[PDB]
Paper text:
Decreasing the incubation time and increasing the ATP concentration allowed us to circumvent this outcome. Thus, to capture long filaments in cryo conditions, we froze TgAct1 samples after a 10 to 20-min incubation period with 1 mM ATP. We determined the structure of unstabilized TgAct1 filaments at 2.5 Å resolution, which revealed an overall architecture similar to skeletal and other [name] filament structures. The most striking difference is in the position of the d-loop (residues 40–51 in TgAct1 and residues 39–50 in skeletal muscle [name]), which forms important longitudinal contacts between [name] protomers. Two of these substitutions, amino acids Pro42 and Ile44, point in the opposite direction relative to the comparable residues in skeletal [name] (Gln41 and Val43). While Val43 of skeletal [name] sits within a hydrophobic portion of the binding pocket, the comparable residue in TgAct1 (Ile44) is displaced by 5 Å and does not make inter-protomer contacts. These changes in the D-loop conformation break most of the backbone interactions that occur among skeletal [name] d-loop residues 41–44 (TgAct1 42–44), and hydrogen bond contacts between side chains are lost due to a combination of residue substitution and mainchain displacement (TgAct1 amino acids 39–41 and 46). The d-loop position and resulting decrease in longitudinal protomer contacts likely contribute to the decreased filament stability of TgAct1, explaining the rapid depolymerization rate constant and high critical concentration. The C-terminal phenylalanine of TgAct1 occupies a different position than skeletal [name] and in TgAct1 it does not interact with the d-loop as it does in skeletal [name]. TgAct1 filaments do not contain an extensive water network within the center of the filament.
The cytoskeletal protein [name] plays a critical role in the pathogenicity of the intracellular parasite, [name], mediating invasion and egress, cargo transport, and organelle inheritance. [name] expresses a single divergent [name] gene (TgAct1) that is essential for the successful completion of this lytic cycle. Unlike skeletal muscle [name], Toxoplasma filaments intrinsically undergo rapid treadmilling due to a high critical concentration, fast monomer dissociation, and rapid nucleotide exchange. Cryo-EM structures of jasplakinolide-stabilized and native (i.e. unstabilized) filaments show an architecture like skeletal [name], with differences in assembly contacts in the D-loop that explain the dynamic nature of the filament, likely a conserved feature of Apicomplexan [name].
Author numbering:
A (entry chain B), B (entry chain C), C (entry chain A): 6 to 376
The structure:
């Protein structure tokens, strides 16, 4: 019996069966409801739409995300999304497979407890487990030492591991991820006269950001060069045929990853977060940590991110250390692949939280078994 | 059948087979335990690490020494270290070889008794013996007259021998050795803003002390010269790439050997200890004792120690006596070489404490056979 | 002419005139700078804010501490803080009064040298002196024998004194104080879903810690009792009207004083630090040291700290010794009161470092005069 691996990100759901090379169901984690609840007679009317179907007819829907910053904010919508995942995407019976779930570090306890309670009492799974996403990413890379910088839609976090041992006091969390970048792109697109306010327009802006943005090697020099020419400008076509043009916004939008003050946030960038995490470890671990900086998540898919991170870390670290940044081509799915690997191990089969232990101990069992 | 020679120092273990020119296993006498007992699934988790392996991954371990000042303080860890020595380093069966052990003079009796009991009942050796380290050092030098000043990691002691005869009433013991010097270097490195507190940082400080320290010929003049220039300063590179610089600390750290008041200790230096040991012998032995002062141990490996000791002894002794200090290049292994020589002698083969005598008399047999 | 007494702690500044019963100026040791450097036309714009004024409008400022762990890390900000202290708080001319300063033991020498240079060349004082804080605390108590455990915001240290004589080799330093506790409270408040990241939020968290925390007599029993009831929970109101609730965090946050492994630190607690300091003295001093354990600083103001310290020391000490822990009600100002007493003594008036000796010898004079 193979386990099911579900990665509940803030933006997307990655689900599949353990042992597969890639997830087989990747759909947006959205729920949409019709603005005008009324349909032509004879047509089937649905109260809400989930996933790709919600994304397809977003023009007449209001879209909601049940997860913000890695924390579930609407449990009914989360339950609907999980039901969709199990019954329409994977097309399996969850009562026959154990389920491996994922969560971000330094989350509130009630989130984990509700996850366990809903898995055991609503879907009637035989067993389950909750794992940290960066640890799974390190599993995917086939390494036992390194620091993982994970950035998706909700949060950014860094977890260092040395020779298989965890360093919990060095875990750092930054509340700046892809959704913040999409909002900032929306805000700065008003300078050119383009106005996006609705949910579907938010999705269009996210599309534009994914297709047109990149990270500059030197920000001031690139701004100066953009002010002196026009070859940086690119065009994008809207669903209705209109065309928008973007200049320095292309590298200005992702610059908020390294300069969080662009969003009005008093916080350090991802480079400084990684450096601070490394400096909170023992002196004898830092060389290897510098040698194995690993990127993971969708927000690390910008062009030129590795070069910029290497430059910043070289500036911050001593001149003798060698900084190496690894950017796998499939790093958008590293968490799922690592979860599949972990759930496929013979030694892991004793770590499941079974239904008997749950019936004995309540939802609090997850705290003393997953850590 | 050759015997095994094991020198259980406070800092290091020297082990080998009798008849060899040098010991074949020299590793630190440490046991390390993981701070966070948890490893990635699929990895082999060990409760504790011994020796070079413990030294290699000290960044995630807490290191302990089972011996302080020549006295075993943790018998389980000592047993683990001996098991490592026999089975992973030497790769022999201790039940087939007699074992020669070493101890410092004026130690408590229970230490020797426990050594004998553990050797006979846990490792099932055929025979064993316990010898004094300075006597073995005198064996190594091919001489029958002289006074040996031995200084390693735990204790310093002086043993005079004349024409092969022992002088037990003249043996002196000083509780100041390399570990005290490492602690004092740690304390005085805080003046420059460098902070070392953990066990791995203790090992790094010991490394620095070994590589950068020396003994000044005249302390006050050298301090004055250091206050007037900067050519004494040297640099050291930490495992993480940072660089520290040391000035007069280089000769201030080992000066506590000759001025124990630097450590807050009411005791005489090694020169005064040696002189007092010589003055406790008969008037007819002192000339030869002055003529054959022999150094042994790792703490006697500082640069310029022989010149300083000669100057101090010349100051203390009458002007007609000739003071000669011998500093063999391999004096860090003189105890092991002397033990090998002693255990390889045809006349020594009747001095072994056999298993029959042990079964007859209990662990108290060691007191009436080794002396 | 009365002297000025300034206690430059890591968290707060206590300043006043010698002979007074209490300090007359107690303000936070912070410097704040506006995030958005722009103000309405006609308003007075200040580059930076110091002290209570910085604390009052922290919502638009970024706050910095110029001292960490008793070591000045930003000398321009320290100079600004001293200028504020002299000219806006005390409202005196520093060129007319001698100044008594304080420092933590085992600090780097450059800190003291810079203090002397800035006092003599920037503020043009006639004389000055630097004293150890625990010694001043012992002055305040009217006793000549005892061991002082001082804990403020930067560091914790223990200094034993017997019959007026100092024991420098027994001074111990622990790098765990109130700021570490505030950071740990911030970290563990994420379990309930409360997120504090900014500097002003750090100040709010420190407020919460001061108002709601206490030390448990037995940690395991108290944790068990907290897991079984809800009467331990208390509520706190934020500046914006929102309400947070805390359960076992109240006694979990200060427990890191006795269990430094909660912070990932390989170090002994304050009880073990005090015991180790006592055990490094002569056998004939320990009875009195056990009899006169004295608390000082703001981190010793938790409820139940004396009982817990007494229990731990009773566990560690022989059963015949009497352990007495003194907790003065005004122990948050013992260093300042002791400094005032010391600077008001007729015999102390020859210990000042005058401007003539400084002009003769440079900033190095402080090393051969204050010790
Ligand atoms: N090629 C790309 N370039 C830039 N950003 C991308 C790219 N692909 C995806 N993203 C961004 O990554 C974010 C979410 O990715 P993902 O790691 O799946 O998030 P989560 O794991 O939280 O669901 C989205 O906001 C999206 O805009
Ligand atoms: N070249 C050197 N210079 C100075 N000190 C040294 C040197 N080599 C070793 N030491 C010191 O010698 C001490 C232990 O040496 P050793 O004689 O092996 O001790 P033990 O016999 O007690 O194990 C260590 O504390 C180490 O710092
Ligand atoms: N009543 C209290 N209970 C607990 N902690 C307190 C209390 N009052 C002050 N503190 C803590 O004491 C710390 C600093 O006190 P103080 O001794 O003035 O430090 P410093 O001398 O380093 O300026 C602060 O971090 C504060 O949180
Ligand atoms: Mg993700
Ligand atoms: Mg030795
Ligand atoms: Mg203080």
């Amino acid at each position: 019996v193979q386990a099911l691996v579900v990665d509940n990100g803030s933006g997307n759901v990655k689900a599949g069966v353990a042992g597969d090379d890639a997830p087989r169901a990747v759909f947006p984690s959205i729920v949409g409801k019709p603005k005008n609840p009324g349909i032509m007679v004879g047509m089937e009317e649905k109260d809400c739409y989930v996933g790709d179907e919600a994304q397809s007819k977003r023009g007449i829907l209001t879209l909601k995300y049940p997860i913000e910053h890695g924390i579930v904010t609407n449990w009914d919508d989360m339950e609907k999304i999980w039901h969709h995942t199990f019954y329409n995407e994977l097309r399996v019976a969850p009562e026959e497979h154990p389920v491996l779930l994922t969560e971000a570090p330094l989350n509130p306890k009630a989130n984990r407890e509700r996850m366990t309670q809903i898995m055991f009492e609503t879907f009637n799974v035989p067993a389950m487990y909750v794992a940290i996403q960066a640890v799974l990413s390190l599993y995917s890379s086939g390494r036992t030492t390194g620091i993982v910088l994970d950035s998706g839609d909700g949060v950014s976090h860094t977890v260092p591991i040395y020779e298989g041992y965890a360093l919990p006091h060095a875990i750092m969390r930054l509340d700046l991820a892809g959704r913040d970048l999409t909002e900032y792109m929306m805000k700065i697109l008003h300078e050119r006269g383009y106005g996006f306010t609705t949910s579907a327009e938010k999705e269009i802006v996210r599309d534009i950001k994914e297709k047109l943005c990149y990270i500059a090697l030197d920000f001031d020099e690139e701004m100066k060069a953009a002010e002196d020419s026009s070859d940086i400008e690119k065009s994008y076509e809207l669903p209705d045929g209109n065309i928008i043009t973007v200049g320095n916004e292309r590298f200005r939008c992702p610059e908020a990853l390294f300069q969080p003050s662009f969003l009005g946030k008093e916080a350090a960038g991802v480079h400084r977060t990684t450096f601070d995490s490394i400096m909170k470890c023992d002196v004898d671990i830092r060389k290897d940590l510098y040698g194995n900086v690993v990127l993971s998540g969708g927000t690390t898919m910008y062009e030129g991110i590795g070069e910029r991170l290497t430059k910043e870390l070289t500036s911050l670290a001593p001149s003798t250390m060698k900084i190496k940044v690894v950017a796998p081509p499939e790093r958008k799915y590293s968490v799922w692949i690592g979860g599949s690997i972990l759930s496929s191990l013979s030694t892991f089969q004793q770590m499941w939280i079974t239904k008997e232990e749950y019936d004995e101990s309540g939802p609090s069992i997850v705290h003393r078994k997953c850590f």
